Structure formats: structure tokens, C-alpha cells
Amino acid sequence: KELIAVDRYTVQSRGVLQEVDRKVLTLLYQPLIGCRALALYMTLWGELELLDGQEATHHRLMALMQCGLPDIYSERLKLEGIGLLDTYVHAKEADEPKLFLYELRPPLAPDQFFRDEMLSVFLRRQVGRHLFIQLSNFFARPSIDETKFTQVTRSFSDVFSAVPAEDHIRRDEASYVLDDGVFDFELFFAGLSKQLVPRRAVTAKVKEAIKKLAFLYGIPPLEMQKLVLGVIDPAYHIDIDALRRAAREWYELEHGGVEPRLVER
Template structure:
């Protein structure tokens, strides 16, 4: 390039950055698909700049460095750079330095197309075929392909975000997430996050009632065109995260839309956080305060006919915290007990009513104590079994009685060298089984059951 000196001289400086994370598979694509189109010298320049990206870490260097690394002249570097720019692998930016008659270049590496994108491209695929011929093109085509699967023979069972995380309440996700903490999501001053297309997730449309949302909005104040696909997706995610009803979301949107009918997503995000803090205060309610969801109650609207059904109904309508409080005779539960229950609700994603059965069951098996390892082991088993209702939990407790007793005995073996005489006790009707109480021979299970029933009766009667 005879006029390269008008554009670039050896003492001009440069820095290298990447538009996205470069992966090892990109090396194969560059070598096998792009090199036949741009030549080995242009590929060498790209790979050298890739190395500089990692080695310099954003620091400046002069083009003397590139000349020494590639063992070629500046005209070659300039001409090969143009090839990279033309095929979309490099963006070049330049600015004049104020203190010197020099330039500073910014070389931004762009990741190559994925193989499927390359072969689908209207020009690149044909260009490659022309360069390498039919035989080699067929080999490359096969190398970057995978066995085809007839997806019509399968049923898609991929879960959406809301399916998997529906039992994790919004307040658990955003607990302690203040406005100040929100700024932590932004990169440090003068820096930007690395980007590249990656895994995405979806929320089902039914997590937010857009029909009700739009019904209360005037088209003159908020035109439908203002709620773009991106804004709609943001509304859906924020509503799910913070538990914002459609009518409240209307007010939030009205507060952030500008005179040009543009809805800024960052402003929408900030307004949603402010709404949550105003509604719930600084201390978010905890999972232990929740009760069994209506959709997972089997005794809702049903009059109990047996003691078992009466207990089921109570465990469906009381929170784990309140149950612990009633078991303690009205005293506030210990922080360690609350934390244990909170942890299993969050980590194992057990519903409140199921956790109530677990608390009731373990209390009667371990001398009115919540043994952490024992509770966690049963909770993990119930989570794997996908127990969702109080009835399912009680039935599983009956079926697995011997297994759970063995777990309790294993725990006891680790803490004692001499075992006490195992004694059979009377148990709650809904368990219908015998079990031992190695922790305390003086512990009367039947008496404990009666006390529990009495305390819960006081709670039910409001006395």
C-alpha cells in the first residue's frame, strides 16, 4: 500500500480490546473458514492482536512492536488490517493526540461468525466454496456439522425461569438489595462489561397480566408503540422479581415515560426498586412468614372429619414461624431454628405447608428438638420426591418411617458409645408406626402429641 504513510506511521500508538469474549472454537473457525478468504498474513495479524489483547491488558504500544512481532513492514500490516476490517473481524478507531503530531489507534477485535452463521451467509459460504473447491469445502462443511436430530419426535420439556424459580419468592431474591447495591451491578467508571451472545432464559407470559395492564392505560398517554418488545420483557421480569401487580405497574410506567413516549428501561428498573422499598420497607418479609399457597391446599373449603384432616387443615393455614411459636407455648422461636427452616425453604424450595409437616414430624421424633442434619436430610428427600402438599408430605412420612428412623439411629451412633434400651411409644394417628426415642428415655411421645394438639387448638380458637 503505497500511501500507507498518510494513514499510519511506526511510532503511532495502539491499544487492543475485544467486542466479546473469544473462545477456542473461534481459532478453528478463523483457521479453517476465514483464512482461505483473507490469507495467512491477515490471520497472523488477527492472532497477534489477540495475543496483544491478553498480554498488554489495555496498555498502549507503538506499531514498532507489531512490526517486530510479525517480522514484516508497516505497509503489510496496514494492508492486512484492511482485510480484517472488510470481512468484519476488526473495528478500527483513531484519534489525534493533542501534545504530539501522532495518532492513537484502537483495534477492536470482533469474534468470527459461528459455523452455522458462516455457512448460512449469502456471500461467505459461496466465497469459501470458490476459494477451496468442492472437495475441501465438503470436508469443512462436514467438520463443522453435527448429527441431525429429528426434534419432531421429541416433546420439548424445557422449563422456563418462572417454572423453576416460582417457589423462590421475590423478597428472597431482592432481600437487602438497596438502591446503593443496585449501583454495584454497573461496571467501574471508565469500563464496560464484556458482551457476546450467550444463554438466555424466558419467563412465561402468564406471570404478568398484560391485558389488565393495558386496559387501564390511556393510549394517548402511553401509546402501544412505547411498550416495545424490550420494554414488555423488562416489565414482565420486574413484575415477577418484585411481585408488582398490573395496576401498580401502570403507575410505575406512567412515572418514567418521557414526552417523546419513550420508556427508559433503567428508569423503569429504578422505579420498580423504589416501589418495592416503599411497599415492604427496608426489611423484606421472610419465607418463614408465608403460608401454604391456595393452589396447593387440599383442605381448602373442606370441613375436617377426622383428627388427621383437622391437622392437615391447620398445617395448611399456619406459617412455619407461627407453628414454631405455638409449639414453644407462645415464645418466639430461636434464631437458629428460624434460620434452619428458612434455609430449607429456600434451598430445597419446599412449600410452607410441607415444611410444617416436617417440623411437626421431627419434633415428635427427636424430643421436641430440631436436629439440623436430620431436618436437612428429610427435606432433601422430600424435595427430590417433589412433595408439594401437606397430604403428600404426611403420606410420605408414613411410607418412609423405617428409613427415617434408620437415619436418626445413624446420627445417634455417632454421638454415643452405649445405646439405651429401645422403647416403643404410641405415635400420632397420621403416622401409624412405631419408632424409638434414643435421645431421652423419659420422653413421652403421646404426651408430647397431646400438648402439640392442645397448643394448635389454642391457636385455631384464637385463645
């Protein structure tokens, strides 16, 4: 009654499902949710591609996995519980049947999983010490010795210019560094900081924000004082969204919206 074979569903994911997760599904989540749940997750992953947003009835699921509906439901719940599945329901019209949305959520990364208190303990219980060790090493790579090693990596500003023309496995998000001397803040704060819009108001995130449009759009600090002071409210809101448009309109005052080009130095 919570689920009827004639109820309808669609499978979506606002993220992608890849091969590093496949392994963490089979080797990490498996021990916790059991093997029938793994199949339920793999088939959903399949249905994702097999219907692009198209709608289906649960008979298809039953047919794809050669299983009866009750089993499917019990394992679904497990997938939900452990965070692999968000399940939504459409506003019910009229005299039934239901419409479902299955949002697929990729597993944790290996580092996040072992750093979770419960999941990591629960796992050691189910698999046993020896195996739990082998599993951890499998998802780990040798660490970097920062004693022997100095980072000489060049920055974004050393390689490029903007000119107008006519321990465990984890995903470390790549952040190019925009150095500092590309933009001077004390000079930016010369005719500014006395405004009682103080060093306090501007974040460290907004610091790097403006730093970017400076490089991108070729802004001298004197000019962006007037862009900041233009878009900031009496409430002392610093909004990234508007400040962008200030900078783009600014850039359109002369270069006509050609947009800058990335070039090497």
C-alpha cells in the first residue's frame, strides 16, 4: 500500500555515477546494505540512462530484476537510509496511482566514508579486522612527504594574462591560485577603508572574488572602489552576483563586450 506495482516512477540524478564509486558500492556499502540492495542501485543506475527523464511503471523494475515487488521495496528503503537514494512523491491526483521520483545519490568518496564515525565502525564489524584493513589500504595511496619536498608550482598569473582582442583517496577540487600582487588591497583601501565599510565586512572569499574580476576584466583598484560602493547596500551586503554585473557593465563601457581572451605571457 506504500507501493503498488502499477505506481509510476522516474529516475534522475543531479550527479554522475562513476567507477570509483562502483567499487565503493561493492566493497564498502555492500557489507552494510547487503547484495540485493546493490542490484537495486545498479539497476536504477541503468534505468537512469535507459529513460532520459521518461516515465515508467514498477512492472519494468520487477521485469528488469526478475524479482517480486515486496523485495524491491524493502531494499529501496535500505538505499534511502544509507543515503544513496532520495525518494520524492508527486502531489497525488486524483484517485491514485502514485508518481515517484528516484533521485540517485553517488556514494561517499573513500576518504569521507572512513572518516564517518558510524559507517566505518559498522563496516569493521561486518567484514572483520583483517579484511577491514585490506579495504582501507585499497582505497589509500602513499602520502606526500612535505619534509623532502618544496612546491615550486607556477600560478595562473605567471602563465597567463587577460587581454582584450577584436592516506585515503579523495577528490581534491582543483583551485588555480591567483596570487596577490595582481591586485593591491591597501591601495584599494586608501580612499575607501575610512568609509566605515571595514576590513571586517569584506570576507576572505569576496577578497579572492574581486581579485578575479580584477585580473579578468583589467580593473585598477581605484575603479573597483566605485563598483563595490555602487552595488553595496546600507545593510552592508556584499553580493558576488551584482558585483559581477558591475564589472561586466564596466568592461562594456570601453571594450564593447568583446570579452577578454586567455593568452600566455
